[PDB]
């Protein structure tokens, strides 16, 4: 049971490096560019709703 | 070299202000390194003053510093090395072996500003440590995972007490222990190093079931604060990552207070009562909270405390008095009586020092001991003016028992082979409970007072009775 | 938004690696069931015992 | 049973009252008292006979 | 997987539009970020940082608003955008906090999830006035005989528990909570005191032991543990009694009764000291803030027995002050001593002399006293006060060739001293408290040996339980003692005393 609990923590740390990888993927891809354009239009809609 | 380059602006002792460049800022509790022909000076970032000027505290000496000196930023809270190759070497505050047992063969590193466990994590205590020391066992039994506290005068064999504890308990325990010495004599350090190599717990031909982190008093106050933190993180690695239970030992936590008070003043905080830091409570609190029995391990701190001028009314001892779980008072007077234990028996208190939990017999025996001694103390005033002779028969029997009990609390120690030379004696818990019961019943009131004096267990008391007899 | 993107991608594209079972065995105590509280011997035997007990007894005092 | 073991033990104290000596009386009483105290402490201390597999 | 569930929860947070009034940290030191911005901000408003840390805004200065960060500065950095949460301090209040160990914000540290909260009410609010008062008379029985007879108080009232450092200060308090179980079990909500223990600056392990003990005595089902642990920072600690009080208002407002034990205001003071000194405010006497008195007076006057008109409710309180080596002349004690309606003063000698409770009843006082307490118990304990008074005076005459009169006093008095010992964490039922004291009143305990007092006591109780359980039920239900009832009771005592 102890090693099982340890494995749950280990899964989170496995997933921790997965967050790092996914951050690098977003910042690597021109999804970095294309989703910034998406954010721009989303902010336009948000700010227009003000 | 980080483009987070800062130039010193003001050296005003430990306070060293750095002028990091535009936009670039570290974070509170981070670590800056300044490369010098005196290694890398570590500055712990403690404030931002804005305009890309931070105010940081120095750890290493600030002599020779050039005002405007380039400062690299490590970028994160001071990270020591932890491992099982931290076992068996003296590691200084900046994580460098000063006993030169070669470079620490780090597995992991961790920050020394690791956060204390949550309420959920804590696993409720019930374990009983037993030290084989009669006063401790009977009159304030210790518990594994505890926060034992050696309140006492200046090194009133305080070090000697720690040495005994390590000698018995640590060796007995299979787990690691962590001995951290904050601001203790470097002479004393060398003796401890040699001595614990001698006890073999530090085996330099093998591994060691103890690690040492000796920070000594000759190190700037800022460094003195984070000697404790450094040691603590190793213990957390043992507790958590290795899973093993340990017995932490820290010395002396008044030095931890004193150090913090000093850099508070330098930090400009308005000094609180008896000049103590306003952040005293939280600093003590962080240290204590970090040390706990979790569902990952158990850590039994023994923290030396120096009680200035034996006044526990002094706020710094009093604050620590709350924060600890298994208090011990080491009184000078009792030392002077020649009794070693030097403990004040009525003033010993421990989290575990219950009734049923210590055993009904144990409780009753201890209630009887406490009353006998308390009576003896009360009657001391009567004896003082009126005289001994004006007491009753019942009182006289109580006085006779009390004097015998007083000297039956005396138990020789291995670490008084450097004092008396007399080899230590350590009596198992069950045996002590039985033996004290007998004494109180007056089954050994046919034994002379001096045949209890500076001798161990009942067998010894009887043997010394025979010895004195012939 | 970026949250959705990051999540969808993170979960999908990064597959879990579950721990080596051998290491788990290592971190537990193995244990094979304990055997026998033993059968202890039948105390006393022969007419040595019978004679001893009958004869020795008279251990009432006068 | 256990009540027999202890009753005869104390009975033998009062039998030794009426028959001088208690040379091996104490040894008989002691043995029956011992194992009686051991089994009662056994049966009350008693952990399960088998492992659980419901929860764990 | 746990990984998927966590992802789902986080994934379900998207879209911001709330941020408006920004601030920018100028400098962050000491947990005192100083912002130029946040032009319109309420005082003690909750502010949410970029880091996410929450604060109150104690200093509103002409050009900077000095936020006090509730959390660590580890993730806080300078220049940070400071979103304006826009709410002055409010905490969930409701029935759900019964059986909940919560942190100051209300986040359960026992992780019992969502809280049944019927309001969010502000934490700093003004106290019930003159007009919100009804006459005080409702018994508060802690199941401790000395407290119940020698120093009892009514519901809605103050009374200090000023005593020696960790001499089971919490233990003395805990005894009351256990006795509240008996009344709690009963349906009547005047008999349902919904207790709150307010753990200020207390180790999570220590409180875990407390929690575990409470669970063992099943007291969790009316208990609330407001927790500001040692690790929990000084802003939380500052607001910790105030926040707790607000919870109490909900029960009180519902006309119900409850008991709030503030433990210990000594650590509250230090936290305020930390705040004030760090806010550079000049510190008061004994380096404890000047307006610490103002804090205490606001807090301690919120305990009130409300008017029948505005609904009879109450919020009994029992502040705990830790005497720094028995010092009662200290600034924080002196102020509190004045505000409180009674004091209970624990004494070290008594503790050593094995008198547990170690309460020194001479230095315990009640300013509500006999106004609340069972009439029955009042009848049979007027004598007790006088007897004990003589025993105290003739105490010092205990150390030779002593007058018969003094010696008689000593016999009655010593037996009483043993009698008021009670094994801590065991409270007693009032319907059996009245008998024990009655025996003492009839002086039949004079004939009982000191060691045998204890055995006598339990035996006497069992004898009453079998033989005279009619009497026990009569004492309980009448709540008063008729001469005929005292007659029968005396007979029972005599009979038991004979055996």
Swiss-Prot record, chain A:
Organism of origin:
Saccharomyces cerevisiae (strain ATCC 204508 / S288c) (Baker's yeast)
Compartments reported by the entry: Mitochondrion; Mitochondrion inner membrane
Known partners and oligomeric status: F-type ATPases have 2 components, CF(1) - the catalytic core - and CF(0) - the membrane proton channel. In yeast, the dimeric form of ATP synthase consists of 17 polypeptides: alpha, beta, gamma, delta, epsilon, 4 (B), 5 (OSCP), 6 (A), 8, 9 (C), d, E (Tim11), f, g, h, i/j and k.
Miscellaneous comment: Present with 12900 molecules/cell in log phase SD medium.
Membership in a protein family: Belongs to the eukaryotic ATPase B chain family.
- What is the name of this protein? ATP synthase subunit 4, mitochondrial
Q: What does this protein do?
A: Mitochondrial membrane ATP synthase (F(1)F(0) ATP synthase or Complex V) produces ATP from ADP in the presence of a proton gradient across the membrane which is generated by electron transport complexes of the respiratory chain. F-type ATPases consist of two structural domains, F(1) - containing the extramembraneous catalytic core, and F(0) - containing the membrane proton channel, linked together by a central stalk and a peripheral stalk. During catalysis, ATP synthesis in the catalytic domain of F(1) is coupled via a rotary mechanism of the central stalk subunits to proton translocation.
Swiss-Prot record, chain C:
Where is this protein chiefly located? mitochondrion
Which superkingdom? Eukaryota
Cell compartment(s), UniProt: Mitochondrion; Mitochondrion inner membrane
Q: Which key words tag this protein in UniProt?
A: ATP synthesis, CF(0), Hydrogen ion transport, Ion transport, Membrane, Mitochondrion, Mitochondrion inner membrane, Transit peptide, Transport
A GO BP entry = cristae formation
One Gene Ontology cellular component: proton-transporting ATP synthase complex
Record family assignment: Belongs to the ATPase h subunit family.
**Function noted in UniProt:** Mitochondrial membrane ATP synthase (F(1)F(0) ATP synthase or Complex V) produces ATP from ADP in the presence of a proton gradient across the membrane which is generated by electron transport complexes of the respiratory chain. F-type ATPases consist of two structural domains, F(1) - containing the extramembraneous catalytic core and F(0) - containing the membrane proton channel, linked together by a central stalk and a peripheral stalk. During catalysis, ATP synthesis in the catalytic domain of F(1) is coupled via a rotary mechanism of the central stalk subunits to proton translocation.
- Give the quaternary structure: F-type ATPases have 2 components, CF(1) - the catalytic core - and CF(0) - the membrane proton channel. In yeast, the dimeric form of ATP synthase consists of 17 polypeptides: alpha, beta, gamma, delta, epsilon, 4 (B), 5 (OSCP), 6 (A), 8, 9 (C), d, E (Tim11), f, g, h, i/j and k.
Q: What else is known?
A: Present with 6140 molecules/cell in log phase SD medium.
Gene symbol? ATP14
Swiss-Prot record, chain D:
User: Subcellular location, in the record's words?
Assistant: Mitochondrion; Mitochondrion inner membrane
The similarity comment for this entry is: Belongs to the ATPase d subunit family.
**What does the protein in this record do?**
Mitochondrial membrane ATP synthase (F(1)F(0) ATP synthase or Complex V) produces ATP from ADP in the presence of a proton gradient across the membrane which is generated by electron transport complexes of the respiratory chain. F-type ATPases consist of two structural domains, F(1) - containing the extramembraneous catalytic core, and F(0) - containing the membrane proton channel, linked together by a central stalk and a peripheral stalk. During catalysis, ATP synthesis in the catalytic domain of F(1) is coupled via a rotary mechanism of the central stalk subunits to proton translocation.
Task: Summarize subunit and interaction data from the UniProt record for this chain.
Answer: F-type ATPases have 2 components, CF(1) - the catalytic core - and CF(0) - the membrane proton channel. In yeast, the dimeric form of ATP synthase consists of 17 polypeptides: alpha, beta, gamma, delta, epsilon, 4 (B), 5 (OSCP), 6 (A), 8, 9 (C), d, E (Tim11), f, g, h, i/j and k.
Question: What else does the entry mention about this protein?
Answer: Present with 6820 molecules/cell in log phase SD medium.
Q: What is this protein called?
A: ATP synthase subunit d, mitochondrial
* Species of origin: Saccharomyces cerevisiae (strain ATCC 204508 / S288c) (Baker's yeast)
Residues included from the entire protein: 4 to 59 of 174
From Swiss-Prot, chain E:
* Chain positions with Phosphoserine modification: 14, 135
- Which of UniProt's keywords are assigned here? ATP synthesis, ATP-binding, CF(1), Hydrogen ion transport, Ion transport, Membrane, Mitochondrion, Mitochondrion inner membrane, Nucleotide-binding, Phosphoprotein, Transit peptide, Transport
Q: Name one Pfam family in it.
A: ATP-synt_ab_C
Annotated binding of ATP, by residue: 163-170
Q: Which CDD domains match?
A: ATP-synt_F1_alpha_C, ATP-synt_F1_alpha_N, F1-ATPase_alpha_CD
Cellular component (GO) terms are: cytosol; mitochondrial inner membrane; mitochondrial intermembrane space; mitochondrial nucleoid; mitochondrion; proton-transporting ATP synthase complex
| NCBIfam families given in the database record | atpA (TIGR00962), PRK13343.1 (NF009884)
Q: What does this protein do?
A: Mitochondrial membrane ATP synthase (F(1)F(0) ATP synthase or Complex V) produces ATP from ADP in the presence of a proton gradient across the membrane which is generated by electron transport complexes of the respiratory chain. F-type ATPases consist of two structural domains, F(1) - containing the extramembraneous catalytic core, and F(0) - containing the membrane proton channel, linked together by a central stalk and a peripheral stalk. During catalysis, ATP synthesis in the catalytic domain of F(1) is coupled via a rotary mechanism of the central stalk subunits to proton translocation.
How is this protein named in the record? Answer: ATP synthase subunit alpha, mitochondrial
Name its species. Saccharomyces cerevisiae (strain ATCC 204508 / S288c)
